Amino acid sequence: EKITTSKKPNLILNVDGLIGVAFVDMLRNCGSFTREEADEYIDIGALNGIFVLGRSMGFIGHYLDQKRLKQGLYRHPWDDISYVLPEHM
Amino acid sequence: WARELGLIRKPASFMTSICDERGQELIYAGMPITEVFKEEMGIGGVLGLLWFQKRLPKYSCQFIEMCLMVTADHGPAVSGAHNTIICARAGKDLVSSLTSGLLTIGDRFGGALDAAAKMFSKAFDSGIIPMEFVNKMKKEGKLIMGIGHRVKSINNPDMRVQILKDYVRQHFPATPLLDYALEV
Amino acid sequence: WARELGLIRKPASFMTSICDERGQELIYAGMPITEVFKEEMGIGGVLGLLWFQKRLPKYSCQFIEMCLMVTADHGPAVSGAHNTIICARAGKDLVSSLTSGLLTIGDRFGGALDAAAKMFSKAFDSGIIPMEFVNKMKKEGKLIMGIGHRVKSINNPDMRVQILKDYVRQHFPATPLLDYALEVEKITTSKKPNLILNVDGLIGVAFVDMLRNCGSFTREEADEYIDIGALNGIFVLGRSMGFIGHYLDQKRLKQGLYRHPWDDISYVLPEHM
Amino acid sequence: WARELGLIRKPASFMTSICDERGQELIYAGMPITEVFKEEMGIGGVLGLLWFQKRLPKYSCQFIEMCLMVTADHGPAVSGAHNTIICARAGKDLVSSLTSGLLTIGDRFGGALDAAAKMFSKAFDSGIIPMEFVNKMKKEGKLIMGIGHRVKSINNPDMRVQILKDYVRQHFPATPLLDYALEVEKITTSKKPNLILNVDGLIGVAFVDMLRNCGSFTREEADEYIDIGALNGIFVLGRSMGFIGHYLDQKRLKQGLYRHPWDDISYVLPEHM
Amino acid sequence: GKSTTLFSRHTKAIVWGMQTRAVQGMLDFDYVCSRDEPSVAAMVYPFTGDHKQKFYWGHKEILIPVFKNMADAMRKHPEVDVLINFASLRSAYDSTMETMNYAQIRTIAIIAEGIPEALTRKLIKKADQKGVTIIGPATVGGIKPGCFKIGNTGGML
Numbered sequence: 001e002k003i004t005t006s007k008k009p010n011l012i013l014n015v016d017g018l019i020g021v022a023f024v025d026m027l028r029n030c031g032s033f034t035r036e037e038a039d040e041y042i043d044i045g046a047l048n049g050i051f052v053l054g055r056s057m058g059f060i061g062h063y064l065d066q067k068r069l070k071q072g073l074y075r076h077p078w079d080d081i082s083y084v085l086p087e088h089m
Numbered sequence: 090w091a092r093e094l095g096l097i098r099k100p101a102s103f104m105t106s107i108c109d110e111r112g113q114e115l116i117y118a119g120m121p122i123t124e125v126f127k128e129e130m131g132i133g134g135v136l137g138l139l140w141f142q143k144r145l146p147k148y149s150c151q152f153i154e155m156c157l158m159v160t161a162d163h164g165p166a167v168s169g170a171h172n173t174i175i176c177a178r179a180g181k182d183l184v185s186s187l188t189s190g191l192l193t194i195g196d197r198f199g200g201a202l203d204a205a206a207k208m209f210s211k212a213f214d215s216g217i218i219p220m221e222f223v224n225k226m227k228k229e230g231k232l233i234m235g236i237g238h239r240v241k242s243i244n245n246p247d248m249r250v251q252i253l254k255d256y257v258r259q260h261f262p263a264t265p266l267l268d269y270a271l272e273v
Numbered sequence: 274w275a276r277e278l279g280l281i282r283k284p285a286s287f288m289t290s291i292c293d294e295r296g297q298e299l300i301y302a303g304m305p306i307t308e309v310f311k312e313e314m315g316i317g318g319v320l321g322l323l324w325f326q327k328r329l330p331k332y333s334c335q336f337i338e339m340c341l342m343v344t345a346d347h348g349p350a351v352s353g354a355h356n357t358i359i360c361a362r363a364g365k366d367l368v369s370s371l372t373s374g375l376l377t378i379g380d381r382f383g384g385a386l387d388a389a390a391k392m393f394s395k396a397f398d399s400g401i402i403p404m405e406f407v408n409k410m411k412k413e414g415k416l417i418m419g420i421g422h423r424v425k426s427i428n429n430p431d432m433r434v435q436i437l438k439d440y441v442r443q444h445f446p447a448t449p450l451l452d453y454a455l456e457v458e459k460i461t462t463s464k465k466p467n468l469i470l471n472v473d474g475l476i477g478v479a480f481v482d483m484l485r486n487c488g489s490f491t492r493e494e495a496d497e498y499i500d501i502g503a504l505n506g507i508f509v510l511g512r513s514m515g516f517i518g519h520y521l522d523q524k525r526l527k528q529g530l531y532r533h534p535w536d537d538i539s540y541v542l543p544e545h546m
Numbered sequence: 547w548a549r550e551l552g553l554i555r556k557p558a559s560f561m562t563s564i565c566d567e568r569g570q571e572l573i574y575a576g577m578p579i580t581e582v583f584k585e586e587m588g589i590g591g592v593l594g595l596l597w598f599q600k601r602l603p604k605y606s607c608q609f610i611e612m613c614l615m616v617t618a619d620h621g622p623a624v625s626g627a628h629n630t631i632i633c634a635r636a637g638k639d640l641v642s643s644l645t646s647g648l649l650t651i652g653d654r655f656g657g658a659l660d661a662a663a664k665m666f667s668k669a670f671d672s673g674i675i676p677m678e679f680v681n682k683m684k685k686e687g688k689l690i691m692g693i694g695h696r697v698k699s700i701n702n703p704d705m706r707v708q709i710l711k712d713y714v715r716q717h718f719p720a721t722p723l724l725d726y727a728l729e730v731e732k733i734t735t736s737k738k739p740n741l742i743l744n745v746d747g748l749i750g751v752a753f754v755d756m757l758r759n760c761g762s763f764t765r766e767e768a769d770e771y772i773d774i775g776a777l778n779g780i781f782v783l784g785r786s787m788g789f790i791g792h793y794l795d796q797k798r799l800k801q802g803l804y805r806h807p808w809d810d811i812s813y814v815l816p817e818h819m
Numbered sequence: 820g821k822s823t824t825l826f827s828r829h830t831k832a833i834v835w836g837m838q839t840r841a842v843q844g845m846l847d848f849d850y851v852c853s854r855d856e857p858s859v860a861a862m863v864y865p866f867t868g869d870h871k872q873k874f875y876w877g878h879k880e881i882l883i884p885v886f887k888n889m890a891d892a893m894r895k896h897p898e899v900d901v902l903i904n905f906a907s908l909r910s911a912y913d914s915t916m917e918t919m920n921y922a923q924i925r926t927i928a929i930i931a932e933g934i935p936e937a938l939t940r941k942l943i944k945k946a947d948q949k950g951v952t953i954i955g956p957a958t959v960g961g962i963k964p965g966c967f968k969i970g971n972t973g974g975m976l
């Protein structure tokens with residue numbers, strides 16, 4: 001982060017990267033994982049599980065909120081599309 | 090440019106009264122993320138913020154965390170965990186395995202939460218005696234959602250409804266539904 | 274109003290070169306729905322219009338209908354049909370039952386439609402003799418996808434690989450990849466008799482051959498769709514009929530919730546964590 | 547060894563009266579796959595077999611193929627194709643993109659296929675006039691399912707309704723429920739032009755006609771297949787071709803991740819919670 | 820009304836209560852007794868809709884329907900003549916009051932234990948008024964070897 005923040009000032013260590021490297025650091029620095037499980041769980045996908053279980057609270061929050069605002073069906077208007085069809089198939 | 094110099098107009102859909110991601114701080118319902126972490130509310134506190142948009146009291150926050158602890162895994166025999174195992178054994182990935190196990194949580198599996206809330210609240214706010222309510226349900230010919238458990242009984246308790254009952258009796262002020270539920 | 278009178282110019286996402294729904298006629302790929310029904314192209318023809326955006330020839334449209342008829346239901350033992358049955362027995366609904374069955378069609382279930390096409394088309398465009406291909410997929414582990422069965426071996430055919438093979442050898446002009454796959458299957462039937470060319474391999478090689486040997490695909494769209502997954506689309510759209518059939522059938526026999534008894538589990542829990 | 551020796555007796559779950567897979571031939575509903583391809587029943591014919599377990603007549607199998615050609619893609623604006631494009635732009639795969647599009651086929655999008663059959667056949671067997679059925683339905687404040695459409699009108703009609711009508715007038719003997727539905731449609735378009743009899747209502751009433759006025763369904767089968775949900779499956783299986791077409795198109799245009807700009811949102815948060 | 824041949828080799832029963840173990844024991848008895856047809860037509864459990872429970876006849880499987888209301892169970896199946904009542908001690912009296920007034924039932928069997936004395940007095944009175952044969956309270960039932968078995972009389976096979 002110190003090296004890459006000198007190129008552009010916005011390149012900071014993201015939250016989606018700090019959780020990853022702090023989680024790997026937890027698994028391979030704290031006890032009870034040896035070093036062959038603590039890089040097995042990263043390959044299996046136990047870091048996608050943290051994001052999916054964390055973001056389920058946000059997606060259930062958005063479901064309950066869009067149900068509580070009595071919002072109707074979505075249609076996504078044709079002025080946001082630009083069909084680029086072939087000439088005559 | 091025509092809206093930056095402010096002349097055009099635009100009706101905006103998707104009203105979303107939760108989690109304003111713009112600005113210099115990730116604001117939740119009305120409370121910023123630094124206030125979430127300074128006030129020391131757990132994940133029950135942000136469940137109250139995102140879902141309910143209220144800063145719930147600190148006994149209700151621990152009760153929401155207690156509910157998310159007891160409604161965790163209950164063996165792989167049950168149908169949702171079984172579908173997750175079938176999709177993991179077909180080698181898919183985490184989100185397709187979890188998602189095709191999540192699409193069983195309907196009415197016969199996992200629907201007893203909403204069903205036993207609405208039934209015991211429709212038999213209490215339209216006030217009946219519990220002895221008349223069980224006779225009404227027997228006369229109509231359907232079971233009461235809440236009550237069951239083929240293994241445990243009044244002899245030996247469940248020890249995961251027991252800890253919840255202990256928490257609500259030792260922390261909840263003015264709990265009539267629980268009392269009414271116990272009556273039944 | 275400003276876009277209607279035309280002075281705003283906002284950039285539009287969602288480029289979508291398929292199915293112009295607006296206007297007065299539901300236009301498909303480039304052809305209206307009235308021409309779709311007048312020119313008597315079936316659901317294989319509208320698959321060629323929606324997926325590939327080409328007017329496929331009338332033998333190829335009927336071949337895609339043949340593929341969606343053979344890759345329909347193949348018994349309820351399999352993983353996806355089993356998941357559909359468990360969600361239908363948990364009383365869910367059609368779209369969640371079919372959907373939670375459709376989230377198994379990855380690599381081990383339903384992946385032989387695409388793996389046995391990428392394999393047989395990578396090792397045919399690299400100029401490899403079938404004996405060298407069988408031996409190359411021997412020294413690297415890697416059992417050949419799309420070759421193998423459990424019972425139907427030889428002088429006892431698959432009888433739904435035979436229908437597709439008859440259709441392709443009678444109707445397809447200039448089919449080299451099916452003939453290469455048949456040379457590979459003739460080499461590997463000498464090892465074991467039940468190493469016949471599977472239906473999941475035959476639809477793969479006949480589909481790749483149809484794309485790169487019929488008209489209107491050059492050769493670089495004809496394997497772009499193979500890389501993108503038109504063959505996975507063929508299997509998923511075919512097996513959706515079987516999964517909806519399993520949902521309706523478990524809903525019609527009025528089956529109850531499933532529990533999967535503890536005699537078939539064998540918990541192997543640790544000691545005290 | 548005790549089962550093959552035959553002295554144990556175990557109660558099998560999963561009754562599944564469809565697609566006997568084991569044996570020397572893949573039997574469908576009751577008809578083997580060589581007979582399926584020899585009688586030239588199309589994907590509508592195997593749909594009849596797998597879903598209803600009745601070998602349907604040839605004017606009904608072609609109607610099922612016409613339904614699955616008409617209920618294919620209807621543009622990317624609508625909510626299911628929108629979710630499929632969002633997921634294909636977030637780069638997932640076929641089953642997750644098609645599946646996250648298929649989990650919107652509910653009651654407001656595309657799940658009117660069954661409610662516009664239950665409602666129109668519950669107000670035909672308790673026979674009222676259309677002008678009182680509309681009065682009752684507005685009086686109760688509920689929507690007449692399969693009578694409304696967001697973007698099409700009578701001054702902007704959808705042609706896929708007309709293609710089905712010109713088939714069900716000719717090859718269908720004695721279809722009165724469609725005439726009832728057209729009566730209700732023009733009763734409602736006399737008031738508001740927006741409310742036009744959908745394809746999601748025309749296929750519902752034409753499928754009730756095809757089930758109860760053709761053979762092999764008596765009256766308990768032909769109402770069980772409405773109560774169970776065999777008409778939503780027509781829309782889901784028909785629209786799977788459109789959603790796989792949208793996945794393939796957004797995969798071939800090499801589009802990027804979608805972000806949905808904040809000028810289309812209007813956050814309406816509380817003050818300080 | 821109290822007939823002599825209560826159960827024969829051609830009898831068929833209606834079970835009241837979700838008692839799949841007892842019905843499978845009865846079907847195993849009727850297979851072992853060299854009997855041609857099973858002695859159970861349908862079951863009654865009023866807490867769910869109608870379906871077909873699957874039971875085991877010998878080496879093979881057959882289906883026994885389970886109804887919700889007793890009226891459909893009497894209408895669809897008129898060949899029965901005996902109703903076994905596995906209801907509880909608090910719901911057997913109303914079940915017998917409902918079940919005696921039907922036509923095709925010639926005998927009932929109250930297997931429940933703990934019935935009230937006044938309730939079984941009114942039950943006996945209506946039973947002798949109607950003419951059915953009641954094998955009632957605190958029983959395990961009966962067994963006619965070669966023909967018929969009520970519930971779990973005798974035990975396992």
Ligand SMILES: CC(C)(COP(=O)(O)OP(=O)(O)OC[C@H]1O[C@@H](n2cnc3c(N)ncnc32)[C@H](O)[C@@H]1OP(=O)(O)O)[C@@H](O)C(=O)NCCC(=O)NCCS
Binds near residue numbers: 461464
């Ligand atoms: C030794 C014995 C068990 C092997 O039998 P087998 O049928 O060859 O079983 P295998 O699994 O080894 O066959 C796999 C072969 O098919 C190949 N194969 C398997 N699946 C394949 C696939 N999808 N694609 C391509 N090739 C495949 C394998 O690579 C292998 O071929 P290879 O020899 O080139 O490696 C058999 O010979 C036997 O029964 N011996 C006992 C006879 C005896 O002496 N009895 C006592 C006298 S009374």
Ligand SMILES: CC(C)(COP(=O)(O)OP(=O)(O)OC[C@H]1O[C@@H](n2cnc3c(N)ncnc32)[C@H](O)[C@@H]1OP(=O)(O)O)[C@@H](O)C(=O)NCCC(=O)NCCS
Binds near residue numbers: 655658688697741744
């Ligand atoms: C799909 C649907 C949302 C489109 O309708 P719409 O163009 O958005 O119409 P609006 O909801 O914006 O306008 C509401 C007015 O029209 C009425 N209305 C709209 N659709 C109606 C319908 N199917 N039936 C009866 N009344 C309807 C409303 O009662 C209301 O009346 P009002 O003028 O007195 O206030 C709606 O018609 C519907 O839910 N139909 C049933 C589901 C269906 O068939 N979907 C297939 C097409 S997507």
